[PDB]
RNA sequence: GUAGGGGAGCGUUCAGUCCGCGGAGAAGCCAUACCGGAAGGAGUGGUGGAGCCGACUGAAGUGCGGAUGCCGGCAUGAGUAACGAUAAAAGAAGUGAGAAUCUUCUUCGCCGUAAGGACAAGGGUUCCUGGGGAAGGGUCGUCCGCCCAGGGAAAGUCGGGACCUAAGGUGAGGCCGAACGGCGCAGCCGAUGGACAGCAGGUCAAGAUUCCUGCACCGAUCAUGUGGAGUGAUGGAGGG
RNA sequence: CGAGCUGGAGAUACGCUUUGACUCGGGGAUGUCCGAAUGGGGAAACCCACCUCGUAAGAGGUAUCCGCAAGGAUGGGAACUCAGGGAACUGAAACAUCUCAGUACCUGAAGGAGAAGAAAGAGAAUUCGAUUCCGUUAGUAGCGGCGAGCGAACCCGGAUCAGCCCAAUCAAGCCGAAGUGGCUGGAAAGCUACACCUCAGAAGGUGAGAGUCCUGUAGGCGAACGAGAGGUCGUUGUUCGUGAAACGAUGACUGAAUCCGCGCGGACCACCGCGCAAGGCUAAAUACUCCCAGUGACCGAUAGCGCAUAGUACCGUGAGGG
């Protein structure tokens, strides 16, 4: 049963956007959006961190080796930022221009 | 399959012993109930162009009186 | 000794197949009454 | 392009356009099953182009008949 | 059309040495005919074809997990030309 | 105190409602010498990982040792019986992580109107190459008809169709019949049969009157000729 | 719709897309072979053709019946409806009339429903006024080896209403309020101190229980395209089993009156009442539920459909089982 299922497969944010971790261990940290997977509702922030072992696989690399790279995350501990405050920061949707739609807070915008 | 009308349809059949009596004997007791069927005959006559076909008996009269659409 | 089942391709097909099963009413009936039970195996034609 | 480069061209070209698109598609195949076919996309893209071509000559030939 | 048909070439010790002989061998399209194949290669290879053969082959039913499946069945075709008229595009293999 | 009627209650779920607990740990499970007149229910300790106890009320798929009951699991019999023809095996050599069993060698034993060879029906990749060893193999297996991957099959003359008809099956019109339908002339389908042009050799790990070499045959359409006036069916006879 | 996409599938490499992809709604085009198959054959998915146009590659046509043509029919559909056909086990503690029951099944036709329908009627009040449906009358009147057992209708209340003609708005989407600090904890949504929203406290996701994170809800907008006669004989139907047997209904024989006339009122007669046969269509309420949605003192892995999916594995020559 899908994860975006109950979230109208809807990504409230976007590839690029800065983010801050609400709930978890990484409570509050900054990250550009490197990967935003809407259906599974998963997404990568430059924060997270992880040590993965990529097993024997002789090609490439005879021996294994390891790797410090980072585990993706669930767009529900992802939070968009408010340039002023920069924290727990909901979103309103307004219109600048000229049929270009946008995004404020309680003090726009981002 | 008569002239006017199809046909062939019918019918079950009973039958009873110690029948007949002083209007009521004691009464009639019955033995049977099975089933039968019914029919007609063959006759060759005309319509529009040329035809031959089956024809009843009632049809035979009804047509020898006059053409109720088909002729002889 | 010798057994019930001695396969014969022409027999098999000319007996149980599809042109065969449709040639008769009760075989149309067999057909759709199979289809309803979601047979993948519709008929020995489908072997 | 997708709209502007097909409807500007006439169908006696389309026949042999189809033809050449095919030909390259075929040589592509031979490559593929010979190895390596390092650009798989090009195949499906040529498919796409073909479908375009036919959609075109079709809708067109039937809209000129008005 | 005059291409679609020749679904691939054939690859093996055999095919290679036949090629070396001046006999070329392809997979083709089951429904096809031998006249059709002759017209095919004669068209898209500008060659004199004087010899031909075909043969439909099944397809190794194989399983990948609890999924017993048949492969698509092909139609290997062999052609022999005349006067050492080798075909270019495969002559390197 | 048996069949039986009566009386009061214990537990299970779902439900309404209140008391309320729970990641400093719910249910479920495990141990035990506590409590209740009994169905039962508490204390604490170990398990577990996210839900649940209690009171009152309502509704039930509501309490199992039996039905040669049903599903499933595991015991007995038992390390027993059997390893599927009494045609029979030895030694050397090799390989491997490991060999009575797999691969070479040299013998021995059995079949030999077969236990050899070639087809058909059926089976379907079991064929060949290289690999694998869980399970299939009645032991073992390094092996296999098992597992993986890749290859292999070639026709104008063989066999079937592009020709024929038998039994039989069909079948417009036709003959019948509550319906579906049952018959049924010609015609058509129908090989087990009629008809019919190619033989000899060579070779892939794996094909062979196919492919390759050598020398043939048959029908078809065109052309240069001999042309130089007849061709000969949907019916006739002969023949088959 | 606006940032990601490249099907489950979880795999590499190839790429695509802010000139707007992917996904969604809405039309179109292409759609091999089999199957009503339908050019002819055939052992379904294969074989062999003939004709028209094309330079070929191709494209069309070549079933049968109703028709002047145009045009319609063929086959499928879980149940629902109508019709031709029509069982038995069973019960009567045996059986045969009888009951099971016009039930099971077979078949024909047809639809989104169908059937029925516009009085020679119920009827007993000189009343109602086409039908279908429910309630009721009513287990009453009656039927019956008067045994088992079978069982109406008129009236009364509702549902929905109709009577016409002929022959001399939903379907894609958008927009939507309001919390933070400390604490335990692997992790806050929980504990806590103070907060604000509510036309929004239905729900679901987030490291453990979130009204104020997310998706949403109340609410508000919302598309180019998109959808709204008599008689006789053998019988039978209704509660109708030959019973006083009316009436309809037909198989075979007979086939009257048309207005000072015809038909019924449960034998039959007068009287006195209700009625216009021999020609047709008809929405509505009603039945079902393959499918879509909402709910639940319905199930949660021996339950629940057979299936957390599969009519598959497996058995069966087959139907079929599973
Ligand atoms: Mg061949
Ligand atoms: Mg295999
Ligand atoms: Mg409760
Ligand atoms: Mg519980
Ligand atoms: Mg037991
Ligand atoms: Mg015993
Ligand atoms: Mg011992
Ligand atoms: Mg013993
Ligand atoms: Mg012993
Ligand atoms: Mg022993
Ligand atoms: Mg042995
Ligand atoms: Mg021995
Ligand atoms: Mg040696
Ligand atoms: Mg060694
Ligand atoms: Mg041995
Ligand atoms: Mg032999
Ligand atoms: Mg082998
Ligand atoms: Mg073993
Ligand atoms: Mg080894
Ligand atoms: Mg016949
Ligand atoms: Mg033969
Ligand atoms: Mg011969
Ligand atoms: Mg022959
Ligand atoms: Mg030859
Ligand atoms: Mg989208
Ligand atoms: Mg096409
Ligand atoms: Mg056909
Ligand atoms: Mg009847
Ligand atoms: Mg009986
Ligand atoms: Mg009885
Ligand atoms: Mg029908
Ligand atoms: Mg009578
Ligand atoms: Mg009667
Ligand atoms: Mg009467
Ligand atoms: Mg369980
Ligand atoms: Mg189950």
Curated annotation (Swiss-Prot), chain A:
What the entry lists under PROSITE patterns is as follows:
RIBOSOMAL_L24
Biological process GO annotation list? Answer: translation
**Which keywords describe this protein according to UniProt?**
Ribonucleoprotein, Ribosomal protein, RNA-binding, rRNA-binding
Q: Does the keyword Transferase apply?
A: no
Gene Ontology CC entries for this record: cytosolic large ribosomal subunit
A molecular function (GO) term: rRNA binding
A single Pfam family, by name?
ribosomal_L24
**Xref: InterPro entries:** KOW, Rib_uL2_dom2, Ribosomal_uL24, Ribosomal_uL24_CS, Ribosomal_uL24_KOW, Translation_prot_SH3-like_sf
Q: Subunit details for this protein?
A: Part of the 50S ribosomal subunit. Contacts trigger factor when it is bound to the ribosome.
Role played: One of two assembly initiator proteins, it binds directly to the 5'-end of the 23S rRNA, where it nucleates assembly of the 50S subunit. One of the proteins that surrounds the polypeptide exit tunnel on the outside of the subunit. Contacts trigger factor (TF) when it is bound to the ribosome; this contact may expose a hydrophobic crevice in TF.
Q: Which family does it belong to?
A: Belongs to the universal ribosomal protein uL24 family.
Protein's recorded name? Large ribosomal subunit protein uL24
Q: Which gene encodes it?
A: rplX
From Swiss-Prot, chain B:
- Keyword Manganese in annotation: no
Q: What does UniProt give as GO cellular component?
A: ribonucleoprotein complex; ribosome
| InterPro entries with a match to the protein in the record | Bacterial_rp_bL28, Ribosomal_bL28, Ribosomal_bL28/bL31-like_sf, Ribosomal_bL28_bact-type, Ribosomal_bL28_sf
What the entry lists under Gene3D superfamilies is as follows: Ribosomal protein L28/L24
* Keywords in alphabetical order: Ribonucleoprotein, Ribosomal protein
Tell me a Gene Ontology molecular-function term this record carries: structural constituent of ribosome
Q: Which GO terms describe its biological process?
A: translation
| Pfam families the record matches | Ribosomal_L28 (PF00830)
Tell me its family: Belongs to the bacterial ribosomal protein bL28 family.
Oligomeric and partner information? Part of the 50S ribosomal subunit.
Q: Please name the NCBIfam families in this protein's record.
A: L28
What protein name does the entry list?
Large ribosomal subunit protein bL28
Please report the organism this UniProt entry assigns to the protein.
Answer: Deinococcus radiodurans (strain ATCC 13939 / DSM 20539 / JCM 16871 / CCUG 27074 / LMG 4051 / NBRC 15346 / NCIMB 9279 / VKM B-1422 / R1)
Q: What is the lineage of its organism?
A: Bacteria, Thermotogati, Deinococcota, Deinococci, Deinococcales
Swiss-Prot record, chain D:
Q: Which Gene3D superfamilies does the record cross-reference, listed alphabetically?
A: 1.10.287.310
Q: Which GO terms describe its molecular function?
A: rRNA binding; structural constituent of ribosome
Q: Where is the signal peptide?
A: none
Q: What InterPro entries does this protein map onto?
A: Ribosomal_protein_uL29, Ribosomal_uL29, Ribosomal_uL29_CS, Ribosomal_uL29_sf
Q: Which GO terms describe its cellular component?
A: cytosolic large ribosomal subunit
- What do we know about how this protein assembles, alone or with others? Part of the 50S ribosomal subunit. Contacts protein L23 and trigger factor when it is complexed with the ribosome.
State the family named in the UniProt similarity comment for this chain: Belongs to the universal ribosomal protein uL29 family.
Cited function: Binds the 23S rRNA. One of the proteins that surrounds the polypeptide exit tunnel on the outside of the subunit.
Provide the protein name: Large ribosomal subunit protein uL29
Specify the taxonomic lineage.
Bacteria, Thermotogati, Deinococcota, Deinococci, Deinococcales
From Swiss-Prot, chain E:
Tell me one GO molecular function of this protein.
Answer: rRNA binding
Give UniProt keywords alphabetically.
Answer: Ribonucleoprotein, Ribosomal protein, RNA-binding, rRNA-binding
Look up the domain of life of the source: Bacteria
Disulfide bonds, paired cysteine numbers: none
Among Pfam families, the record links this protein to: Ribosomal_L23
Q: Which InterPro entries match?
A: Nucleotide-bd_a/b_plait_sf (IPR012677), Ribosomal_uL23-like (IPR013025), Ribosomal_uL23/eL15/eS24_sf (IPR012678), Ribosomal_uL23_CS (IPR001014)
Q: Give the CC-aspect GO terms.
A: cytosolic large ribosomal subunit
- Annotated SUPFAM superfamilies: Ribosomal proteins S24e, L23 and L15e
Which is a GO BP term held by this UniProt record?
translation
Instruction: Please give the PANTHER family that the UniProt record associates with this protein.
Output: 60S RIBOSOMAL PROTEIN L23A
Tell me which NCBIfam families the record gives. PRK05738.1-3 (NF004359), PRK05738.2-4 (NF004363), PRK05738.3-2 (NF004366)
Quote the subunit structure annotation. Answer: Part of the 50S ribosomal subunit. Contacts protein L29 and trigger factor when it is bound to the ribosome.
**What job does this protein perform?**
One of the early assembly protein it binds 23S rRNA. One of the proteins that surrounds the polypeptide exit tunnel on the outside of the subunit. Forms the main docking site for trigger factor binding to the ribosome.
Q: Identify its protein family.
A: Belongs to the universal ribosomal protein uL23 family.
- Which HAMAP family does UniProt cross-reference here? Ribosomal_uL23_B
Q: What is this protein called?
A: Large ribosomal subunit protein uL23
Originating organism: Deinococcus radiodurans (strain ATCC 13939 / DSM 20539 / JCM 16871 / CCUG 27074 / LMG 4051 / NBRC 15346 / NCIMB 9279 / VKM B-1422 / R1)
């Amino acid at each position: 049963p899908s994860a975006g299922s109950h979230h109208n497969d809807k990504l409230h944010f976007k590839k690029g956007d800065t983010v801050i971790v609400l709930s978890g261990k990484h409570k509050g940290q900054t990250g550009k959006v490197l990967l935003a997977l809407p259906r599974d509702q998963k997404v990568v922030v430059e924060g997270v961190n992880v040590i993965t072992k990529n097993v024997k696989p002789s090609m490439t690399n005879p021996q294994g080796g390891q790797e410090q790279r980072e585990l993706a995350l669930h767009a529900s501990k992802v939070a968009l930022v408010d340039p002023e405050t920069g924290k727990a920061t909901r979103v309103r949707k307004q219109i600048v221009d000229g049929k270009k739609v946008r995004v404020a807070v309680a003090s726009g915008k981002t | 399959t008569g002239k006017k009308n199809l046909v062939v349809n019918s019918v079950i059949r009973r039958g009873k012993a110690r029948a007949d009596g002083g209007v009521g004997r004691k009464t009639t007791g019955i033995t049977k109930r099975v089933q039968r069927a019914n029919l007609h005959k063959k006759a060759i006559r005309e319509n529009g162009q040329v035809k031959t076909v089956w024809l009843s008996a009632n049809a035979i009269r009804t047509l020898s009186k006059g053409p109720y659409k088909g002729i002889e | 000794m010798k057994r019930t089942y001695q396969p014969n391709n022409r027999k098999r097909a000319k007996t149980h197949g599809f042109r065969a099963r449709m040639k008769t009413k009760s075989g149309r009936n067999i057909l759709a009454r199979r289809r309803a039970k979601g047979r993948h195996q519709l008929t020995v034609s489908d072997e | 392009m997708k709209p502007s480069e097909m409807r500007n061209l006439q169908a006696t070209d389309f026949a042999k356009e189809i033809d050449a698109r095919k030909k390259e598609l075929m040589e592509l195949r031979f490559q593929a099953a010979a190895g390596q076919l390092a650009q798989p996309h090009r195949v499906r893209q040529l498919r796409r182009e073909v479908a375009q071509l036919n959609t075109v000559k079709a809708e067109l030939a039937r809209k000129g008949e008005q | 059309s005059h291409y679609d048909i020749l679904q691939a070439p054939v690859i093996s010790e055999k095919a290679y040495s036949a090629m070396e002989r001046g006999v070329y061998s392809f997979w083709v399209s089951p429904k096809a005919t031998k006249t059709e194949i002759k017209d095919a290669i004669q068209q898209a290879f500008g060659v004199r074809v004087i010899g031909i053969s075909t043969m439909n082959v099944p397809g190794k039913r194989k399983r990948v997990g609890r999924f017993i499946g048949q492969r698509n069945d092909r139609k290997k075709a062999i052609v022999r030309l005349a006067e050492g008229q080798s075909i270019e595009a495969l002559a390197g293999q």
